[PDB]
Amino acid sequence: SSRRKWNKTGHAVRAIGRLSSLENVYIMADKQKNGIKANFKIRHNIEDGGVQLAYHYQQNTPIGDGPVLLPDNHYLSTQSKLSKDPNEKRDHMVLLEFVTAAGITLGMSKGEELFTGVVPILVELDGDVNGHKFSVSGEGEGDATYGKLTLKFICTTGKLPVPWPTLVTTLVQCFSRYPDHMKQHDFFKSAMPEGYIQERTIFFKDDGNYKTRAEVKFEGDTLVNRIELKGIDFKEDGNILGHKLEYNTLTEEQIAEFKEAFSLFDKDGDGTITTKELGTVMRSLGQNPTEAELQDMINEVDADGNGTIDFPEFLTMMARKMKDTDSEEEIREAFRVFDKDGNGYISAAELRHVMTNLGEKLTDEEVDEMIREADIDGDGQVNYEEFVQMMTA
């Protein structure tokens, strides 16, 4: 029973750790400066084990003179993916991010209209850390409907004197997705096109700090983020100047596939799936759930409780990994949806029917090429074994 004592005590201590390790961006109004303030912590993994904490303090204020939206307390949730470009010989970072706003319970600007489509982005940074001067240039696109950013950054001075992950937060929160009931709390878009000034201090525990000032604004059709950074008090042999942090190089391909699938449900392209939209899709495939049943389905996956499914919630649902036998049954059920006449073979006619009903457009010849790619035995249709290979390999 000594072991029972160790276990029970260890569980309680670990519970406290799981509860307190949140990396969300917590935002409040700053009415005195006609803007907002924020605070949060980032946990950077150290190579070969450990974490380097980075404590962030933030303030934003408008550049122009027009009225802006000042929010109730809330937070932003972010997922980032870092990678490398096989063809690029300069020191660089490729970045993909999804961000959503939450923390205000369902009971509920001109700049918002500037973000309804895909917007080009330019980022320019001049830095000086412990006297080491450097510059960074980036370009890409933002798609606020999905809370999505995609950019590539290059060090334009040679070798970057600090780790790329430490610069991610410095290198456009106007691209966050604010849900319908939170539109009156989106300070960032409300300040456009004239823009805002964003300032931070970032404290690296047991090491130095960065101080940053940036201007974020439209220049023509392009959203531009221009930044100055100064770092002081860094240790030559610490995790930053010593380059001891992990560069975390699920896949981009898969996420893009899931985005395309999401769009088949999201008929009006506003970035969320309503009961009306889900029902339209289900009826097109021959299932006719009631309004209450549709709402029961949505409720299960509705993380922020606003009653509709956004892309990150859809992504979470589809990313959940299954027991190999549960995944097997899921594929059998999918096969039955395609095989409309139940004869054990999916015909070209059946495949076209399912695709066009979902809302996809393609020619008969394109449908035939799909059957060809899957049709191992050459009989002109797709049997169950062929379907499994197509879906899982």
Q: Name the minimum Å distance from CB 42 to a second copy.
A: 15
Q: Name the minimum Å distance from CB 74 to Ca ion.
A: 15
From the list 104, 85, 310, 61, the residue with the least C-alpha distance to 195 is 61
Q: Is 280 among the annotated ligand-binding positions? A: no
- Touching Ca ion, residues 287-346 (CB under 5 A): 302, 304, 306, 339, 341, 343, 345
Q: Find which of a second copy, Ca ion, none residue 129 binds, CB within 5 to 8 Å per kind.
A: none
Q: Which is closer to a second copy, CB of 4 or CB of 89?
A: 4
Q: Find which of a second copy, Ca ion, none residue 270 binds, CB within 5 to 8 Å per kind.
A: Ca ion
Q: Find which of Ca ion, a second copy, none residue 252 binds, CB within 5 to 8 Å per kind.
A: none
Write phi, then psi, for 256 (nearest 5 degrees): -65, -35
Q: Find which of a second copy, Ca ion, none residue 291 binds, CB within 5 to 8 Å per kind.
A: none
From the list 98, 272, 74, the residue with the least C-alpha distance to 180 is 272
Q: Is 126 among the annotated ligand-binding positions? A: no
* Six token digits for residue 316: 């979470």
Q: Find which of Ca ion, a second copy, none residue 18 binds, CB within 5 to 8 Å per kind.
A: a second copy
Write phi, then psi, for 308 (nearest 5 degrees): -140, 165
Q: Name the minimum Å distance from CB 312 to a second copy.
A: 14
Q: How far is CA 151 from CA 68, 123, 155, 215, 337, in A?
A: 28, 9, 14, 18, 39
Q: Name the minimum Å distance from CB 381 to a second copy.
A: 15
Q: Which is closer to a second copy, CB of 48 or CB of 236?
A: 48
Q: Is 39 among the annotated ligand-binding positions? A: no
From the list 330, 374, 334, 383, the residue with the least C-alpha distance to 354 is 334
Asked if residue 163 has a cis previous peptide bond (ω within 30° of 0), the answer is no
Can you tell me the distance from the alpha carbon of 143 to that of 223, in angstroms, rounded to the nearest whole number? Answer: 12
Q: Name the minimum Å distance from CB 120 to a second copy.
A: 25
Is 214 exposed, middle or buried, given 0-12, 13-18 or 19+ CB atoms closer than 10 A? Answer: buried
Q: Which is closer to Ca ion, CB of 171 or CB of 309?
A: 309
Query: Which H/E stretch holds residue 52?
Result: strand 51-62
In this structure, what is the dihedral angle of CA atoms 287, 290, 291, 295, given to the nearest 10 degrees? -70
Q: Find which of a second copy, Ca ion, none residue 325 binds, CB within 5 to 8 Å per kind.
A: a second copy
Q: Which is closer to a second copy, CB of 70 or CB of 354?
A: 354
Asked if 266 touches Ca ion (CB under 5 A), the answer is yes
Q: Is 384 among the annotated ligand-binding positions? A: no
221 contacts: CB under 8 Å, gap ≥ 6: 119, 120
Q: Name the minimum Å distance from CB 122 to a second copy.
A: 30
Q: Is 377 among the annotated ligand-binding positions? A: yes
Can you tell me the distance from the alpha carbon of 93 to that of 90, in angstroms, rounded to the nearest whole number? Answer: 10
Residue position matching structure tokens 């001075």: 157
Q: Name the minimum Å distance from CB 296 to a second copy.
A: 7
From the list 216, 204, 227, the residue with the least C-alpha distance to 135 is 227
In the chain, what is the straight-line distance between the N-terminal and C-terminal CA atoms, in Å?
48
Binding region for Ca ion (CB under 5 A): 266, 268, 270, 302, 304, 306, 339, 341, 343, 345, 375, 377, 379
Binding site membership: which residues?
266, 268, 270, 272, 277, 302, 304, 306, 308, 313, 339, 341, 343, 345, 350, 375, 377, 379, 381, 386
Binding residues for Ca(2+): 266, 268, 270, 272, 277, 302, 304, 306, 308, 313, 339, 341, 343, 345, 350, 375, 377, 379, 381, 386
